[PDB]
Structure 1
């Protein structure tokens, strides 16, 4: 009397599961991404890369660049008074 053969002819549950879509995404997502993000390049120097690192890269939201930029325009027209003098 019949001995049937379905559970060993399974391969549609081996594609049927939902995380397979996620799997084939994230083996690709993590095989070329940085190991831990040690940066893709961390060397810089132009003597304004330091300015950027302290102010215009997270470190200071402090008002010092505003002051620096402000002071330039104060220096500009004040000297120009004496250029018109």
Structure 2
């Protein structure tokens, strides 16, 4: 008998629907992320950070410092051999 009006009721609609939560989630997820690996600070030196940079990053990751640390125990007690026996 009259004009019905659901073309323009998106005003208080855009809270209730389910991907609104994902939309408001990832507009918050996307702003403070650094763009392209920026602010990396790829070099730092504290007399042993170079040891981590050469040995303990994701790139090198080989067991050799263990080997070095193995030799460290080989370096340790054998000298104590020369202190004891």
- TM interval, short-chain normalised: 0.7 to 0.9
- Confirm or deny that 1:78 pairs with 2:78: yes
Q: Which stretches in structure 1 are left out of the alignment for 5+ residues?
A: none
Give the TM-score normalised by the residue count of structure 2. Answer: 0.74
Relative to structure 1, is the Cα distance of residues 4 and 63 closer, same or farther in structure 2, using a 3 angstrom cutoff?
closer
Q: Which stretches in structure 2 are left out of the alignment for 5+ residues?
A: none
Q: How many equivalent pairs are there?
A: 85
SS of the residue 1:8 aligns to: coil
Relative to structure 1, is the Cα distance of residues 81 and 13 closer, same or farther in structure 2, using a 3 angstrom cutoff?
same
1:8-35 CA-partner distances (Å, limit 9, x unpaired):
3333443343221111111111111212
Superposed displacement of residue 65, structure 1: 0.6
Q: Structure 2 CA distance, aligned partners of 1:40 and 1:59? A: 15
Runs of 4+ in 1 over 6 A off after TM superposition: none
Give the TM-score normalised by the residue count of structure 1. Answer: 0.74
C-alpha root-mean-square deviation of aligned residues, in Å? 2.2
8 Å CA contact 1:55–1:65 kept in 2: the answer is yes
